[PDB]
Write a protein that binds this ligand. Structure first.
Ligand SMILES: Nc1ncnc2c1ncn2[C@@H]1O[C@H](COP(=O)(O)OP(=O)(O)OP(=O)(O)O)[C@@H](O)[C@H]1O
Lengths: 516, 418, 76
C-alpha cells in the first residue's frame, strides 16, 4: 500500500498524488503494437497507468521481433497483440493488461461502440483509409485519439480532442501576483503598519512607492526614465553604511514589482467564449467555473482575477515574512469563497446541486485562475477536407524547403502512393529506383488535388523511398516518449497538450508543432 | 542472426541517399561490421542508461559496455525498466547487462560496477563512441577531460583518429537536452559550462536565524542539527536513503517549522531537500536517450550528418525542441590546444589565483591545486595542504609561468594556464 | 529596434532594444514580460551565447532577429 508511494515518488513530484490517482484510473487503448506503439505503452505502464488493451490483428514478423524490445524471436508467428501484451505486462504488476486478436478495421466494422470504454485511444502506424475512418468514429463517440506514426527518420504524431480545458496548467516561470499596482485593503493596511535588512523587499518598495505617490500622484508606469529613478530613490534610504542586501534586492525587483496585475489575454478569450457565456444543464464543470470567475471579476473582483496568494521568498525577518505571506493567503482565501458563491449561484440557475463542485476544485481553480488554458483540435476530417484544408499554414511554412512540414506532405504523398500502389515507396531493395519516379507522381497528384503551389526538393522523394517504410527503433522510441507524455497530459488533464500535428526529423534532430 | 531481423537498419546502410553523410559507402557488409567491430561505452545505467542500452542494442550494436557505480533502488523502478523489485539491492550495471543480454538475442553487454573515475586513458581508448547519462555535472566534466587527454597532437595538428565522439544526455523533469561532442573540434562540456542553471544555495544566515520556507527548516535539521547532536551515534553520517534518518530529520524539521510556525513540511519534502532529488519520469528520458542513440548510430555508420552539438527539449507546454550549434570557446579551460594564456595580475598576488579558478563562472573548479616550476603550492586534496594552508613571497617567485592546476575530479586532465 | 526572444517553450516574446543595450538589459526585458529570473536565462543568437556584459550590437543583433532562451540539464 505504502510501497506504491515509494515506487512512483520521482513522478509524484511532478503531477502529485491526485494526478497519479487519475492516471491509475485510466484505460488506454493502443491500436497497433509495433515498435512505436510498444514504446508508447511502455512509457505509460511504468508510470502505473490504470490499464491497457492492445488491439492488433497482425502476426509477429521476423523484422518485428527485430525492432521491438517487447517481442522475442520466440514470439514470431504468434499474435503481435497478445505477444506484446505479455511483455509489457511484466513492466508493472499494478497495471492490468488485455488484448484483442482482431484488426482495427475488423472492429470499426463489427463493433465501433467498443472504443467508448477507453479513456484515450492511441493508434500507431495506420494507413489513410483506417486513420480517417477511426478518427471519425472516435470523434463522434467523444473519444480522444492520438495517431502516432514512425516512418524512416520521421516521427509523425497528431492529436484529436474536440475540446480539452485545463486548470492546473503548470507553467515554467510566471509573474508574481504581488499586486502593488492595484493593492487591496488588508495589504494596504499591512503596509501602513510599518533590524533593517529583516524587512520584506515588497514593503521596502511599497513604502518608497507610497512616498513617490505624494511627491507626484504618479505611478512609475513610464518606463525607463521613471522606474530607474525610483530605484535611485530607494538607495537614498540606506542606513548609516552597513548592509541592505534586501534593499538592493528590492531595487532589482523594481523591474517587475510595479505592474504585476492585469488579466491575461488567454483568459479574456476564455471569458469571451460562447461556452462561457451561454450556460446550460449541458455545460461542463470547467466552464461554469470560468463564468464563475468572470462574474467575480465583474463584481467583487473589482476588475481583476482572484488574488493568487503566493509570494516569492525574500530576505526578511522570520515572523515578518510570514505575516506578509498570510496577508496574501487570507485575501486569496476570501476571493476564493467569493468565486465560490458565484459558482453555487450558477449551479443553481441550472439545477445541479451547489455541492456538485468540490471545494478542492474551487480552491485550485482560483490559484491557477491566471493560468487557465483550453485546447480545441480540428477534427481529422477537417484537415483532410478539400475546402477545409488549412492550406494557409502549409504554404506559410514551406518558405524554407527544409521545414519539417515537407515531411508532412511527403507522408501524405507516401500514403497516397500506398492507397494507389498497394505497398509503400521502395520496401524491397530494388523497388527503390522504379518507385522514386512513381512516388513523385503522387506527391504532385496530391499537391494538385488540394491546390498547393509549393516546391518539394526532389531529395525528399529519394529519401522517403530509401526509408522503405522502415520503423527504426531510435525513432519509434523518441516518438513513444513524447506521445506517452501527451497521453498523460490528457488523462491527468494536468498540462498543456500540443496542438494539432507534431513532426520530428531524425536527420536534422529537430521538431515542430503545427496548424492551430 | 535470423531472417528479417535487421531490416530496420539495412535500409540505411545498404541503400545510398540524398542527405547521406559524405564519407558514406552503401554496403551489404556495413551491418555485420558494426555488429562485430564497433565498441561503445555507455556511462550510467538508470533512466538514460537503460533506455540507451535498449536503443543501441536494437540499432545494430553488439559490443557494448556499461559503467555504473550505483545499486538498484526501488525508486528507480518507475522509469528504469531494466530493473524489477527482485533485482533491488543489486548492481545496476550488472542487472542492466544481465537483462539486456537476455532480451536481445545475441547482444554482448559488459557491465562495470565502477564509477567512471576508476579507469584511466588505457581503458577508454578502447571505445569508438561514448554516450553519457550521468546525474551529476562533475562526472560529465570529468569524463569530458578523460576523452580529451586521448587527443593526439602531431605538432599542432590534431590526429583525426585520436578523437572519441562523446554524446551526452540530460534530463530533469519534463525538460531535457542532448549534445554531440568531438573533443578538439566541437565545443566540449567545459565550453558550454554556463548553460547550466545556478544551483539554489541557501545563505546559512537565514537557515539558522530567519527561516521562511519549509525547505529552510529541513535544510537546517540537516546541514546543522544532525552534525551537532549526532543522531545515530557519533561520527555516523547522514544516510539520505535510510528511512529512520529521514524520519528523524522529518520529525526535527517538523518541530523547527513549528518554532517559527512555517507550515508545509511533508515527509516527501524532507526527502527532496535532503537527497536533492530531481523529479523524473520515463517519458522524457525516453526522448533524450532516443536522440543520443540515433546520433551514435549516425556517427558510427555515417548514414546521416551528426547533430550539431545541441538540442533542448520541453514537454510542459506542448512539444518544443530548439536545436542549435553551440560555439567552441577559443579559450576553453579544457579543449584549448594551447595553455590558458591568462594573467590575473602583476603585483597583486596569488590568493587572487585560487579565488579566480574557484569562482570565475568559466572554470568553477572545486577545491583546486596549483603546481609550479616542480613545487606544490598547496592542494586541499589533506596533510599535503596543511603544510601550505599558507603570501607575496612566491607571488613573485612565479616570474612572468605555466602555474598548473588539477581539481578534485573536476577534470581528469592537468590544467595548464599561464 | 524590435527583436523577438523565443522562450524555452517557444512562446516568443517581442522586445524593444536599441543596439547599445547591454545583453544584461535584454534579459531584464524578458523578465519584465515573462517573470523569468535573469539569473537563469541563457540567450543564444546563432550559436554564440549572449554574454550579459556586451551589447546587442556587439552580437550583430538587428531588426527582427530571433534570440533563443536555452538550458543545460543535470539529471539523467
Ligand atoms: N560519477 C558517476 N560515475 C559513474 N556512474 C554514475 C555517476 N553518477 C551517477 N552515476 C549513475 O548514473 C545514473 C544516474 O541516473 P538516475 O536518474 O538513476 O539517478 P540517482 O538514481 O542518481 O538519482 P535518483 O534518486 O533521482 O533516481 C545512476 O545509474 C547512477 O548510479
Amino acid at each position: 500500500k505504502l510501497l506504491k508511494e515509494q515506487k512512483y515518488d520521482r513522478q509524484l513530484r511532478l503531477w502529485g498524488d491526485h494526478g497519479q490517482e487519475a492516471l491509475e484510473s485510466a484505460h488506454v487503448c493502443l491500436i497497433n503494437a509495433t515498435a512505436t506503439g510498444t514504446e508508447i505503452l511502455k512509457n505509460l505502464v511504468l508510470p502505473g497507468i490504470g490499464s491497457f488493451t492492445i488491439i492488433d490483428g497482425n502476426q509477429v514478423s521476423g523484422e518485428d521481433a527485430g525492432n521491438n524490445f517487447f517481442l522475442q524471436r520466440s514470439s514470431i508467428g504468434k499474435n503481435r497483440a497478445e505477444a506484446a501484451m505479455e511483455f509489457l505486462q511484466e513492466l508493472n504488476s499494478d497495471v492490468s493488461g488485455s488484448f484483442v486478436e482482431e484488426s482495427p478495421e475488423n472492429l470499426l466494422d463489427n463493433d465501433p461502440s467498443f472504443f467508448c470504454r477507453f479513456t484515450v485511444v492511441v493508434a500507431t502506424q495506420l494507413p489513410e483509409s483506417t486513420s480517417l475512418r477511426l478518427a471519425d468514429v472516435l470523434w463522434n463517440s467523444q473519444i480522444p485519439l492520438l495517431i502516432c506514426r514512425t516512418y524512416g527518420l520521421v516521427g509523425y504524431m497528431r492529436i484529436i480532442i474536440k475540446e480539452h480545458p485545463v486548470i492546473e496548467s503548470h507553467p515554467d516561470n510566471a509573474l508574481e501576483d504581488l499586486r502593488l499596482d492595484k493593492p487591496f485593503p488588508e495589504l494596504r493596511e499591512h503596509f501602513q503598519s510599518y533590524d533593517h535588512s529583516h524587512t520584506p523587499w515588497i514593503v521596502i518598495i511599497a513604502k518608497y512607492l507610497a512616498q513617490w505617490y505624494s511627491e507626484t500622484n504618479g505611478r512609475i508606469p513610464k518606463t525607463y526614465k521613471e522606474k530607474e529613478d525610483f530605484r535611485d530613490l530607494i538607495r537614498q534610504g540606506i542606513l548609516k553604511p552597513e548592509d541592505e542586501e534586501n534593499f538592493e534586492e528590492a531595487i532589482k525587483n523594481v523591474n517587475t514589482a510595479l505592474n504585476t496585475t492585469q488579466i491575461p489575454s488567454s483568459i479574456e478569450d476564455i471569458f469571451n467564449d460562447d461556452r462561457c457565456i451561454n450556460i446550460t444543464k449541458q455545460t461542463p464543470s470547467f466552464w461554469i467555473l470560468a463564468r464563475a470567475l468572470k462574474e467575480f471579476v465583474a463584481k467583487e473582483g473589482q476588475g481583476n482575477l482572484p488574488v493568487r496568494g503566493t509570494i516569492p521568498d525574500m530576505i526578511a525577518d522570520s515572523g515578518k515574512y510570514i505575516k506578509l505571506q498570510n496577508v496574501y493567503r487570507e485575501k486569496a482565501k476570501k476571493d476564493a469563497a467569493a468565486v465560490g458563491n458565484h459558482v453555487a449561484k450558477l449551479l443553481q440557475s441550472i439545477g445541479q446541486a451547489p455541492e456538485s463542485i468540490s471545494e478542492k476544485e474551487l480552491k485550485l481553480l482560483c490559484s491557477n485562475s491566471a493560468f487557465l488554458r483550453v485546447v480545441r483540435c480540428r477534427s481529422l476530417a477537417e484537415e483532410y477536407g478539400l475546402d477545409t484544408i488549412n492550406k494557409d499554414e502549409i504554404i506559410s511554412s514551406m518558405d524554407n524547403p527544409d521545414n519539417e512540414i515537407v515531411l508532412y506532405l511527403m507522408l501524405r504523398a507516401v500514403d497516397r502512393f500506398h492507397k494507389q500502389q498497394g505497398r509503400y515507396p521502395g520496401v524491397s531493395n530494388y523497388q527503390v529506383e522504379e518507385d522514386i519516379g512513381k512516388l513523385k507522381s503522387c506527391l504532385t497528384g496530391f499537391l494538385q488535388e488540394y491546390g498547393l503551389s509549393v516546391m518539394v526538393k526532389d531529395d525528399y522523394v529519394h529519401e522517403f523511398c530509401r526509408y522503405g517504410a522502415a520503423e527504426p527503433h531510435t525513432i519509434a522510441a523518441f516518438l513513444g516518449g513524447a506521445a506517452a507524455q501527451e497521453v498523460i497530459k490528457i488523462i491527468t488533464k494536468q498540462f498543456v497538450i500540443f496542438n494539432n500535428t507534431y513532426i520530428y526529423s531524425g536527420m536534422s534532430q529537430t521538431s515542430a508543432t503545427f496548424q492551430l | 542472426d535470423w531472417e528479417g531481423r535487421w531490416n530496420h537498419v539495412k535500409k540505411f546502410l545498404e541503400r545510398s541517399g540524398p542527405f547521406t553523410h559524405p564519407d558514406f559507402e552503401p554496403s551489404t557488409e556495413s551491418l555485420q561490421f558494426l555488429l562485430d567491430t564497433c565498441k561503445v561505452l555507455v556511462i550510467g545505467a538508470g533512466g538514460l542508461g537503460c533506455e540507451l542500452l535498449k536503443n543501441l542494442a536494437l540499432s545494430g550494436f553488439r559490443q557494448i559496455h556499461v559503467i555504473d557505480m550505483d545499486t538498484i533502488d526501488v525508486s528507480n523502478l518507475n522509469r528504469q525498466f531494466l530493473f524489477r523489485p527482485k533485482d533491488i539491492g543489486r548492481p545496476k550495471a550488472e542487472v542492466a547487462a544481465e537483462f539486456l543480454n537476455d532480451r536481445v538475442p545475441n547482444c554482448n553487454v559488459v557491465p562495470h560496477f565502477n564509477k567512471i573515475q576508476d579507469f584511466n586513458d588505457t581503458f577508454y581508448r578502447q571505445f569508438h563512441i561514448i554516450v553519457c547519462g550521468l546525474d551529476s555535472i562533475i562526472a560529465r566534466r570529468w569524463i569530458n577531460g578523460m576523452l580529451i587527454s586521448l587527443l593526439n597532437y602531431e605538432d599542432g595538428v590534431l590526429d583525426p583518429s585520436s578523437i572519441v565522439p562523446l554524446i551526452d544526455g540530460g534530463t530533469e523533469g519534463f525538460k531535457g537536452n542532448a549534445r554531440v561532442i568531438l573533443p578538439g573540434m566541437t565545443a566540449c562540456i567545459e565550453c558550454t559550462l554556463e548553460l547550466y542553471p545556478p544551483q539554489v544555495n541557501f545563505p546559512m544566515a537565514t537557515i539558522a536565524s530567519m527561516p521562511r520556507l519549509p525547505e529552510h527548516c529541513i535544510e537546517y535539521v540537516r546541514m546543522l542539527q544532525w552534525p551537532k547532536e549526532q543522531p545515530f551515534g557519533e561520527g555516523v553520517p547522514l544516510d539520505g536513503d535510510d528511512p529512520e534518518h529521514i524520519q528523524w530529520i522529518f520529525q526535527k524539521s517538523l518541530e523547527r517549522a513549528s518554532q517559527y510556525n512555517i507550515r508545509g513540511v511533508t515527509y516527501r519534502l524532507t526527502q527532496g531537500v535532503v537527497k536533492r532529488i530531481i523529479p523524473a519520469v520515463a517519458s522524457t528520458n525516453a526522448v533524450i536517450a532516443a536522440v543520443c542513440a540515433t546520433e551514435v548510430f549516425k556517427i558510427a555508420t555515417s548514414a546521416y550528418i551528426p547533430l550539431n552539438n545541441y538540442l533542448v527539449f520541453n514537454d510542459v507546454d506542448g512539444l518544443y525542441t530548439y536545436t542549435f550549434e553551440a560555439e567552441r570557446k577559443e579559450n576553453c579551460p579544457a579543449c584549448s590546444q594551447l595553455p590558458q594564456n591568462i594573467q590575473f595580475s602583476p603585483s597583486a598576488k596569488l590568493q587572487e589565483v585560487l579565488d579566480y579558478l574557484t569562482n570565475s563562472a568559466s572554470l568553477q573548479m572545486k577545491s583546486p591545486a596549483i603546481t609550479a616550476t616542480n613545487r606544490t603550492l598547496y592542494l586541499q586534496s589533506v596533510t599535503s595542504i596543511e603544510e601550505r594552508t599558507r603570501k607575496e613571497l612566491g607571488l613573485v617567485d612565479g616570474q612572468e609561468a605555466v602555474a598548473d592546476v588539477t581539481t578534485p575530479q573536476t577534470v581528469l586532465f592537468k590544467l595548464h594556464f599561464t | 529596434m524590435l527583436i523577438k526572444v523565443k522562450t524555452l517553450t517557444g512562446k516568443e516574446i517581442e522586445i524593444d532594444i536599441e543596439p547599445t543595450d547591454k545583453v544584461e538589459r535584454i534579459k531584464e526585458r524578458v523578465e519584465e514580460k515573462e517573470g523569468i529570473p535573469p539569473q537563469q536565462q541563457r540567450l543564444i543568437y546563432s550559436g554564440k551565447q549572449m554574454n550579459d556584459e556586451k551589447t546587442a550590437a556587439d552580437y550583430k543583433i538587428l531588426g527582427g532577429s530571433v534570440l533563443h532562451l536555452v538550458l543545460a540539464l543535470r539529471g539523467g
